[PDB]
Design an enzyme around this catalytic site. Structure first.
Site, PDB file in Angstrom:
ATOM      1  CE1 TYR A 191       1.127  -0.385   4.418  1.00  0.00           C
ATOM      2  CE2 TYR A 191       0.633   1.937   4.128  1.00  0.00           C
ATOM      3  CZ  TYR A 191       1.219   0.920   4.850  1.00  0.00           C
ATOM      4  OH  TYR A 191       1.899   1.214   6.010  1.00  0.00           O
ATOM      5  CG  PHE A 233       2.091   9.007   5.499  1.00  0.00           C
ATOM      6  CD1 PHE A 233       0.928   9.307   4.810  1.00  0.00           C
ATOM      7  CD2 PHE A 233       2.047   8.029   6.481  1.00  0.00           C
ATOM      8  CE1 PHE A 233      -0.250   8.636   5.083  1.00  0.00           C
ATOM      9  CE2 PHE A 233       0.872   7.356   6.758  1.00  0.00           C
ATOM     10  CZ  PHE A 233      -0.278   7.659   6.058  1.00  0.00           C
ATOM     11  CG  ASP A 234       2.790   4.639   5.770  1.00  0.00           C
ATOM     12  OD1 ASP A 234       3.869   5.014   6.272  1.00  0.00           O
ATOM     13  OD2 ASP A 234       1.857   4.148   6.440  1.00  0.00           O
ATOM     14  CB  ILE A 291      -6.820   2.618  11.234  1.00  0.00           C
ATOM     15  CG1 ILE A 291      -5.982   2.430   9.968  1.00  0.00           C
ATOM     16  CG2 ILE A 291      -6.101   3.522  12.224  1.00  0.00           C
ATOM     17  CD1 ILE A 291      -5.879   3.673   9.114  1.00  0.00           C
ATOM     18  CE1 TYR A 323      -2.472   5.511  13.802  1.00  0.00           C
ATOM     19  CE2 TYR A 323      -2.610   6.411  11.590  1.00  0.00           C
ATOM     20  CZ  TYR A 323      -2.179   5.430  12.458  1.00  0.00           C
ATOM     21  OH  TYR A 323      -1.452   4.364  11.981  1.00  0.00           O
ATOM     22  CG  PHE A 358      -3.915   4.344   2.809  1.00  0.00           C
ATOM     23  CD1 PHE A 358      -2.722   3.755   3.192  1.00  0.00           C
ATOM     24  CD2 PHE A 358      -4.416   5.389   3.565  1.00  0.00           C
ATOM     25  CE1 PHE A 358      -2.043   4.197   4.311  1.00  0.00           C
ATOM     26  CE2 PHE A 358      -3.740   5.836   4.684  1.00  0.00           C
ATOM     27  CZ  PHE A 358      -2.552   5.241   5.057  1.00  0.00           C
TER      28      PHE A 358
END
Lengths: 515, 316, 107, 325, 48, 92
Positions: C26, C36-37, C56, C82, C99
């Site tokens: 992902y 960021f990922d 999550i 979050y 995502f």
């Protein structure tokens, strides 16, 4: 790094050979045991053999067995020639490996020529580089000495304890990692957990020598240094360190000596505010000095002067956090000095016998500073001990003076005077010395008699005690403990009576019986 | 108690300690002279250097310069340095070999002269590189604190000054007068004040503890080395250094080592008198008392010799 | 909740259920197009069970809604993300996450 | 004993041969090097230090008597007794004060008494030329900056308008020159020097900075900065202090910040003195003028002391980030 | 003054009893100067 | 890449992936504790010559078998999708 690897290889090889040689020597000793037990024709020779090198202190036996290095003691050592030759060959191999006795044929020679060449090529301007090369050259040139210094850190364990050993190493690693970090709440909690795990580990108290070699006491001492310098900001830290140190003292005797080597710092940091904590550096020092005759005899008078000064201060000024909480001010602090008097009692009295030197030093310091007695037994106040005790009884009786109760000043008065009387009682000289007629012993006994009259002692001994009674219907009413007079005070005073004055005439005996 | 009944791992640990105490420690190996000789040689830098014989310092010179830099660095208190201790021991042993020699034997005049020349050469190999100033800097940086650093520095100074070497004496005197410092003499006075004397209370405590099972004069080696160092400083009847020890002209403050030495001797005399009063009643002196008396009398012998050197050569 | 946008088609029949293992590569990015990922940088598939709530909740619903072999985009509100108690130094106190996830090797 | 406050100057009354040797009993004057005041005896306050205008031979004149008897001097080893002229009184410590004892202070209020005490003869020790020069610059700089502060406070709150301030003009040129001289005086030693001489110069700089710090020049500079920072810009400064005085405002501000940085640089105690001044530096970080100077001051304080870093708060960090923003 | 230094005229000396280990003290609480060996100390000027 | 940037990236990698483990292992390297094991007794100071007839051969450093007890390293893979939860210390 490569030199460190070489040193580790050498020490591991030494450990393996130690295992094998220990096995061989144990087998040989058992065989000789059987031989001598079977052949006991010569009674005197058998007795001498059984005395020396036979079921003796193990370290003495191995020291005398390994003495065949000297030619004269080679015949004295009963070890087989094959065993002795094996040890000599291993020693020669160790010397050869260390290098004790042109293209470089080894790391030592290569690094030596490396350092010499780099030093000769130019004038190195980097102090760190210079220190590195010269330290490396020193390590290369001193091979046997490096192993000699490394041996004290070496230790051997059984295969079954490797898991617990690894767990203890992990906990110690957490403790060491927490040192570089500034202390906070999370760090505090982690140190509490690590110390708890260390204390719960079975290997911790089963190998005090291994703990001392690891030097965990020094690490927890540094943690205590940091927290004490901070303040209390982390009273949980201070209490945990003190409990761990006290347990470490209680484990064995050499641990107690190692803790005693740091006596001065603990007493210096022992204060009234820090001493009111549940576990204190004063308690650590008391544990490090308690029930050891040689440790008590090695006490320096400077520490006694320091604790006497703290006692004098506590008897001079009132209790700061007590008056902050709001308890009525007596003008002096008995609860703070109770701890100091307990420490002095541990210092003077060991194994039921009074230490003459420590007792003399303590009594001279106490008479030198006459402010250590408070209102009663005072040079200026001159208050009778019996009157002071009855005054404290009535103070505990009326809540107006007792209430600000978590802390009872009325009971604190009794505790302080009882501790003082008990300390002076155990400072008394021994009866055999008194009978022999030592001038110093007679002087000390006379001084104690002068300070504490007998009539006041027997009066407080004869003072009444509250007896439980079910005055309420079906409810058993009892005196309020930790706030009223208890027989422990009478026990301390009668200890004084027996030690200093004593019973000499039946009349007096009968009287004391009736009173 | 038998080893076979003893567990294997405990026996292995005890054997490790026994081997450490008996074999490795007793083994003797000499490397100081060889290593100093290897470090002294410059190699080929002087071979390729034509304008100057040796512009770049040799490895030993670089090492002593590094130690001098560490000493001269402004530090509130001197810290422990095993590297400095080991290196100072190495150089001290290397230069003390000839002094130590490395039965009514009749040593010839020629043999004595060559021994003296060898000692002078070995002392030259170190004082022609900065040791004579390094010892002064280290003593000044000690700030009058007893320890292994000052002990090693004093031993190195004694090894360098052994035999009353006029060249090294001149070097130290010139350095002291040029820098015009008070830290050296302040530290020396503090070290004298922090010496040790016989203690009857300590003796009684030791006897009682040993009975129910030396500390009554420790630092004896330290005080003997300190006074030997002072005697070597004044050795050779050098009126300049003798007068400098009396009064340090030019400096803002002067310290009287001569008087200090006398003061210490006094305190030692009082301690010996107390020991005599203690042992006067008893018929026969015991072995512990004999050992303590020997220690105190040797220290007193050193102090006397130092005082003699101070005035031996006519020094009004 | 979680918004599901399809990018490429998949099997469409083998949907994950409670109690199985899902591995997916992902790429996580913020609302303003800030990445960021990325599991592709680590060169390893991210593994998670369905039902243990380790991830999550919005990610769990997005993965469960899609089938095997399907690459889809997931839009997660801070309510399911979050939210206010975001990752310090990684995720701001209020941001929606996007995502792109592809499902393969369902177990 | 190391501070410049213990420094006194002894000068004979005779103007001729002032540098001559002090004679036993020769009248002379005692003057404080730092404060600039002369020791004297007055009726109402006993003996005190008074201004030069109030100084007179009737009070400021003393003599170094050999001994207490009523019927040349070596600098040290002197048993001289300080006797005031035209009087039989001598300098001696007052009766031991239990209050002073309680305070633990050695402030033995010196009193002039005809009886005196046994401990009256006193030793004299000359200080170093470095300390003497430093004390003289401390005195002159304190006077000049006090004059500058008085000038700044003169027009505070009253608009200038068209007519310049009727009071005395500000010593702008003298202040600027003194700041430049002090910056050059406190400039750090060069790194190209040898290690030993560099360490000696660092020690000299450290003790000089300590002397100025204990004499309080740092607080004086801070007060000057606080006085000058009230006005936002040069035009706002001109609206009160005058157009002619306007042009030097930025230069004086920058010189003050640079001098403060020079004073605090390399002195951990001086940096620690700003433990409560974190707000003072952070709230001025955003100043348009001398922004580099205040940033350098904060850098020095943070890199020198740990406690000033331990006190650092969230708002402080946010302000430092807003500096980049 | 320090222990080991020779005492001199016009100097204060602290006198302590060898047996009772008490100083020669001048009690004044009774209203008259009474010399008694107590734990408080008082200086003595030893003049021939 | 420019030299300063290359050094910065190398140091950043070492700091964010190896610092804690390296520090812990360096701290543990000080002490030598060895168990009684066959692997322990198999260690020889002078390894035998493979060719034969070679004695006093020094083994290559870092190649011999080491049985001294060293705690293993612990790492936690980075994860930023897991739900964000006294508090245990995080891993490298």
């Amino acid at each position: 790094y490569f030199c460190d690897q070489e040193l580790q290889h050498r020490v591991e090889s030494l450990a393996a050979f130690a295992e094998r040689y220990v096995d061989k020597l144990q087998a040989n000793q058992r065989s000789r045991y059987a031989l001598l037990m079977r052949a006991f024709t010569m009674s005197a020779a058998e007795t001498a053999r059984r005395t020396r090198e036979f079921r003796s202190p193990p370290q003495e036996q191995i020291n005398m067995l390994l003495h065949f290095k000297d030619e004269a003691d080679e015949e004295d050592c009963p070890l087989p020639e094959d065993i002795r030759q094996d040890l000599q060959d291993f020693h020669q191999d160790l010397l050869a490996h260390c290098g004790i006795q042109k293209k470089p044929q080894s790391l030592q020679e290569l690094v030596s020529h490396m350092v010499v060449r780099w030093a000769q090529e130019d004038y190195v301007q980097s102090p760190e580089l210079v220190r590195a090369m010269f330290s490396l050259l020193h390590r290369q040139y001193d091979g046997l000495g490096e192993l000699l210094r490394a041996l004290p850190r070496a230790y051997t364990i059984s295969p079954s304890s490797v898991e617990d050993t690894m767990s203890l190493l992990e906990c110690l690693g957490q403790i060491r990692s927490l040192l570089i970090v500034q202390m906070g709440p999370q760090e505090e909690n982690l140190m509490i957990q690590s110390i708890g795990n260390i204390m719960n580990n079975k290997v911790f108290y089963q190998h005090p020598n291994l703990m001392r070699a690891l030097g965990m006491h020094e690490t927890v001492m540094e943690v205590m240094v940091n927290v004490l310098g901070g303040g209390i900001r982390f009273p949980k830290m201070v209490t945990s360190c003190c409990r761990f140190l006290c347990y470490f003292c209680r484990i064995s005797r050499q641990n107690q000596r190692s803790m005693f080597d740091h006596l001065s710092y603990l007493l210096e940091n022992s204060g009234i505010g820090l001493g009111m904590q549940g576990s204190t550096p004063l308690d650590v020092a008391a544990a490090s000095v308690i029930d050891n005759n040689e440790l008590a005899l090695a006490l320096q008078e400077q520490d006694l002067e320091k604790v006497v000064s703290y006692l004098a201060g506590c008897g001079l000024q009132s209790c700061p956090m007590l008056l902050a909480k709001g308890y009525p001010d007596i003008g002096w602090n008995p609860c703070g000095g109770e701890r100091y008097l307990d420490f002095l009692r541990f210092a003077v009295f060991v194994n039921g016998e009074s230490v003459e030197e420590n007792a003399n030093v303590v009594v001279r310091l106490l008479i030198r500073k006459p402010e250590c007695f408070g209102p009663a037994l005072r040079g200026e106040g001159g208050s009778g001990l019996l009157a002071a005790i009855e005054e404290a009884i009535r103070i505990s009786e009326d809540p107006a003076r007792d209430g600000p109760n978590r802390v009872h000043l009325g009971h604190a008065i009794m505790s302080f005077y009882a501790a003082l009387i008990d300390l002076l009682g155990r400072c008394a000289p021994e009866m055999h010395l008194i009978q022999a007629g030592k001038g110093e012993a007679l002087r000390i006994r006379a001084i104690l008699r002068s300070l504490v009259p007998l009539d006041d002692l027997v009066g407080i001994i004869s003072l009444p005690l509250q007896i439980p009674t079910l005055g309420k219907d079906g409810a058993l009413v009892q005196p309020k403990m930790s706030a009223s007079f208890v027989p422990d005070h009478k026990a301390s005073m009668v200890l004084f009576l027996d030690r200093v004055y004593g019973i000499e005439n039946q009349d007096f005996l009968l009287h004391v019986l009736d009173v | 108690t038998p080893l076979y009944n003893l567990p294997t791992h405990r026996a292995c640990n005890m054997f490790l300690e026994s081997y450490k105490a008996a074999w490795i420690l007793t083994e003797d190996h000499s490397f100081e002279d060889r290593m100093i000789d290897d470090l002294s040689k410059a190699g080929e830098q002087e071979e390729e250097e034509e304008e100057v014989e040796e512009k770049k310092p040799d490895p030993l010179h670089q090492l002593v310069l590094h130690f001098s830099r560490t000493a001269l660095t402004e530090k509130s208190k001197l810290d422990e340095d095993y590297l400095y201790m080991a290196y100072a021991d190495i150089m001290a042993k290397s230069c003390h070999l000839e002094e130590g020699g490395e039965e009514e034997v009749e040593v010839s005049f020629e043999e004595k002269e060559m021994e003296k020349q060898r000692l002078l050469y070995q002392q030259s190999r170190l004082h022609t590189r900065g040791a004579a100033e390094m010892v002064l800097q280290m003593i000044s940086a000690c700030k009058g604190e007893t320890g292994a650093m000052v002990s090693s520095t004093l031993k190195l100074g004694i090894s360098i000054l052994n035999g009353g070497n006029a060249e090294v004496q001149q070097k130290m005197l010139d350095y002291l007068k040029d820098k015009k410092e008070v830290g050296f003499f302040q530290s020396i006075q503090a070290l004298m004040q922090t010496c040790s004397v016989l203690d009857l209370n300590a003796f009684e405590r030791q006897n009682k503890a040993e009975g129910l099972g030396e500390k009554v004069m420790a630092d004896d080696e330290f005080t003997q080395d300190l006074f030997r160092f002072l005697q070597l400083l004044c050795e050779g009847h050098n009126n300049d250094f003798q007068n400098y020890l009396r009064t340090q002209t030019g400096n803002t403050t002067t310290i009287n080592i001569i008087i200090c030495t006398v003061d210490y001797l006094l305190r030692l005399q009082e301690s010996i008198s107390d020991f005599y009063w203690y042992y006067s009643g008893k018929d026969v002196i015991e072995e512990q008392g004999k050992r303590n008396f020997s220690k105190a009398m040797s220290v007193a012998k050193q102090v006397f010799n130092s005082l003699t050197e101070y005035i031996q050569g006519p020094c009004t | 909740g979680v918004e599901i946008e399809t990018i490429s088609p998949g099997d469409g029949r083998t949907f994950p259920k409670k109690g199985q293992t899902c591995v997916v590569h992902y790429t996580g990015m913020l609302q303003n197009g800030k990445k960021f990922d990325s599991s592709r940088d680590r060169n390893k598939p991210f593994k998670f069970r369905i039902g243990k709530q380790e991830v999550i909740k919005g990610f769990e619903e997005g993965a469960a809604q899609m089938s095997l072999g399907q690459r889809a985009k997931l839009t997660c509100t801070p309510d399911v993300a979050y939210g206010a108690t975001g990752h310090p130094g990684v995720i701001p106190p209020n941001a929606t996450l996007i995502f792109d996830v592809e499902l393969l090797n369902l177990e | 004993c190391t501070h410049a406050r213990s420094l006194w100057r002894l000068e004979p009354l005779r103007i001729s041969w002032s540098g001559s040797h002090l004679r036993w009993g020769q009248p002379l004057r005692i003057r404080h090097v730092t404060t600039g005041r002369y020791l004297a005896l007055t009726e109402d306050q006993g003996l005190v230090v008074v201004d030069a205008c109030k100084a007179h031979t009737k009070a400021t004149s003393f003599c170094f008597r050999v001994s207490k008897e009523k019927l040349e001097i070596k600098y040290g080893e002197s048993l001289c007794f300080v006797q005031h002229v035209a009087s039989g009184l001598w300098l001696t410590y007052a009766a031991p004060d239990p209050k002073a004892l309680r305070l633990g202070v050695l402030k033995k209020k010196a009193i002039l008494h005809q009886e005196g005490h046994m401990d009256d003869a006193l030793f004299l020790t000359r200080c170093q030329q470095e300390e003497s020069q430093a004390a003289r610059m401390i005195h002159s700089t304190a006077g000049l900056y006090n004059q500058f502060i008085k000038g700044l406070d003169s027009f505070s709150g009253k608009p200038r308008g068209s007519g310049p301030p009727a009071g005395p003009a500000l010593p702008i040129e003298a202040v600027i020159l003194s700041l430049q001289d002090l910056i050059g005086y406190f400039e750090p030693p060069s790194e190209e020097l040898q290690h030993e001489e560099k360490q000696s110069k660092l020690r000299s700089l450290r003790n000089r900075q300590s002397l100025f710090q204990e004499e309080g020049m740092l607080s004086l500079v801070l007060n000057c900065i606080d006085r000058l920072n009230v006005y936002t810009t040069a035009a706002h400064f001109a609206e009160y202090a005058g157009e002619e005085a306007a042009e030097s405002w930025k230069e004086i501000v920058n010189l003050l910040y640079e001098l403060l940085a020079s004073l605090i640089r390399g002195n951990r105690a001086n940096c620690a003195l700003f433990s409560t001044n974190l707000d003072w530096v952070v709230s001025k970080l955003d100043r348009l003028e001398a922004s580099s100077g205040i940033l350098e001051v904060l850098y020095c304080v943070l890199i020198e002391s740990p406690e000033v870093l331990n006190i650092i708060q969230e708002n402080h960090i946010k302000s430092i980030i807003s500096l980049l923003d | 003054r320090s222990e080991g230094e020779k005492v001199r005229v016009g100097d204060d000396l602290i006198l302590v009893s060898v047996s009772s280990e008490r100083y020669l003290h001048l009690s004044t609480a009774s209203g008259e100067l009474q010399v008694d060996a107590s734990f408080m100390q008082t200086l003595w000027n030893m003049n021939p | 890449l420019p030299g300063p940037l290359r050094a910065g990236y190398y140091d950043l990698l070492i700091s964010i992936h190896l610092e804690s483990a390296c520090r812990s292992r360096r701290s543990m390297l000080s002490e030598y504790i060895v168990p009684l094991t066959p692997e322990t007794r198999a260690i020889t100071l002078f390894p035998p010559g493979r060719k034969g007839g070679n004695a006093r051969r020094h083994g290559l450093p870092g190649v011999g078998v080491t049985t001294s007890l060293r705690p293993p390293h612990h790492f936690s893979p980075p994860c930023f999708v897991a739900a964000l939860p006294e508090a245990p210390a995080r891993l490298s």
